[PDB]
């Protein structure tokens, strides 16, 4: 039932200045009114960040995603190393009731999607391992920080109602941990 | 002739600690002493000899020191199946095996 | 001079005469750096 | 009437006797600390 | 937050651990000229020396009569030696087997013999045993490597291979690296033997139970040791590393015959005598070297560097910086956004970035060094 | 190894005799080895009796000099013990073992239990 | 796990972090992810059960 | 810097190039504490 | 963990067609199954019961 569309989804790759993002705390340890130094994985200050308007993008060390979402256009996410059944593969869907995070060995289509008129993104479902459930995300900004330090996958969360026109705003926001995962995976592609 | 007065003989010490086996002679056997390991119901097995030279197959936790009428066989870490009689035997003259320390659990 | 500084004795002759020289060297070194750091402490306090 | 120290007893330290007690094995292990007691004795002769 | 790897204003924040840096000069870090065009230099001589025939030799000598050899003027490829699993034991104590491929020595010594399988642990620094104390003694600083591999099918005979002999009793110990051939009687008591027969008089010739049916932990393992030296002669026994071309008066990194260092090479008016191999000046820093092939004198100073300092007048007053590099003529710097720009100034204490000299005179505030000082 | 194999029957009646044998595998008798025996009496422990040389020379302990005579078989590759008048105090595990002062290699031993 | 005791100085192992001292009532407001605290100079001073 | 401090070599560049860092590090540590105690001694007399 | 749904399941398969179930990421209090007499043989080999 899955066929690939013909025209390529060649998003325009613009460049602008970031001015802020990547400002957060590392773990779940409180401090009070003190300045603490850390070596961590960061988008450096005042850097050159790319504008996107579904091809595979490179791994990086750490990917920062933001979406200036309006009424939930972006729907799902595909992550993995080989993205097949020989090794575990990550799938993220913010469906109507929850957010679902799985690290499981699906057999995906070339363009797996919700099949609007959820789980039709796999051709086969064998030996699937991890499941995670949390609250629904939903003129909004949804922020992810993908980090992998010392065999630990840290995924922070932040939700913001956003209204700016083009670039990343002049403001500050920390991102709080929702899930920590002690999983050793060498993810190479995502979607 | 040179007689062998043992000291360890029998002892009840717990696991992994130090075991002393003092063999005292009448005259000087300064280089002449051997040190065997005999499980009860088995054959003796030589641990050290010839001024602290260890037998092939014997570990290095066993050490020897002393000369003359003060000698020792030391176990740095005791085991349950180390329950054995550990004889000293000199070879300065007609030899004589010591009393043998039956190291007990 | 009558403290071990983490070694096993406060007289050097006993270090020589109790156990084998190869591994006694580190204990000698331990007593040496104990007595030296004490001496350097003593030199320092004397300098102060 | 006020009382105030103005010197101390002039003291010097044999490095190798105090740290070894006249042992060749101790001093041989002690030499690999390099220029180790020349500066102590220089400080103490400087103290002297 | 603050990026501590970005601009010099932000790096001053990161060191002082505050967001409010007061006006002045702070120490940020040290800088260095990173080396490029890596140079590596060996002598001309490039023939192989057969360590393989010594490694793969069928008959060895005894444990107390080990055969000793000196090898010079070759290249030895430790890579083909490293990956091989034919040796049951391959352990290097004072060195790592993977890094031998870079360094070049001379006067390598190898002693070989045959021993039982359980005693292959006995050949090691700081080990006591029968052959560790009565047949071959090892120093505490015994840098090198050792090799053992099983030879039960060959060095054991069905009649009992008693040709591998060793001494059982002796009056005293043996010094490390000495060989004895005198097969003499042992006095085990108070009667002087004079080498004939009888009690307290034993023959040190005694045998092993070598048989081909015997399994692991008692099989005849052939054991070869590898001993090296450090810096006594112009090095001849090299490793599998090739050479390149040498460049002068640029900060490079160099491997001169196993001597690794960094710096700027130039032409030296000093006078090496022909017996000299290299140079040093004070406290084991190689100050001049004659190269191993063209045999011409160069001299080494490690390439010029210092600390980096930031002149920032306070984060409330402004955000623009100046950067001091401590004690470099500011030509050998290869921050490429700043280094190419409006003005770059050079001090007797190094060089200044982002600042222009003025003819003025002021009661100055932020000191630079060498009598010059900086301000916003 | 110098494996020393003891062989034969073991149960004997009181006031009987033991004719014991120690077969040698893995060592030449034509050497400096003193082919000896060690018994294990309760109270005395192990006790050195004596050994033989391949030419015939012998050296014993004075407690068991008067009863022990031993002989050698070089091509048969063994060495033996002869105990005359085996007493109840000879209730001991007798270990044949190769000796050059020390006893580096042993036989496993046969206890004499008279019954 | 056992019950915790206050205002008598005991050994405590709050969620795997082990420390000694006396426990008092505190007025500070932790954020919903911060489990335990540390005030200054890298020393524990406040813990939430 | 020309004292071994009980290590196997007195130049750190040899230590990195001669062994693996899991075993080089203890030799570097003896060199570090050797140079550091000497540096602290040098700093202490220089502080004096 | 639903070990009750494993130990008190309504139907089990045959031995040569054995049911495979994956159990992960929960808490199992083994005291209630230890004190239950509903198991005829309970022989532990990995660690003691």
Author numbering:
A (entry chain B): 14 to 66, 81 to 144, 154 to 174, 185 to 237
B (entry chain o): 1 to 105
C (entry chain A), H (entry chain C): 964 to 1011
D (entry chain A): 722 to 769
E (entry chain B): 286 to 619, 631 to 672
F (entry chain n): 1 to 115
G (entry chain A): 528 to 576
I (entry chain A): 334 to 382
From the manuscript:
JE-5C, JH-8B and JM-1A belong to Class 1/2 and their footprints locate around the ridge of RBD, heavily overlapped with that of ACE2. The Class 1/2 cluster mAbs, JE-5C, JE-5A, JH-8B, JH-11A, JM-1A and JM-6A, competed with both FI-3A (Class 1) and C121 (Class 2), although asymmetric competition could occur. For example, JM-1A and JM-6A blocked binding of C121 (Class 2) as well as FI-3A (Class 1). The currently circulating XBB.1.5/16 has been shown to have a significantly higher resistance to humoral immunity than BA.5, BA.2.75 and BQ.1-like subvariants, while a reversed phenomenon was seen in some mAbs (JM-1A, JM-6A, IW-12A and JE-4C) in that they exhibited enhanced activities against XBB.1.5/1.16 compared to BA.4/5 or BQ.1.1. This may be attributed to differential competition between ACE2 and antibodies at the local interface where newly emerging mutations such as F486P and F490S enhance the binding of these antibodies, but not others like JE-5C or JD-2B.
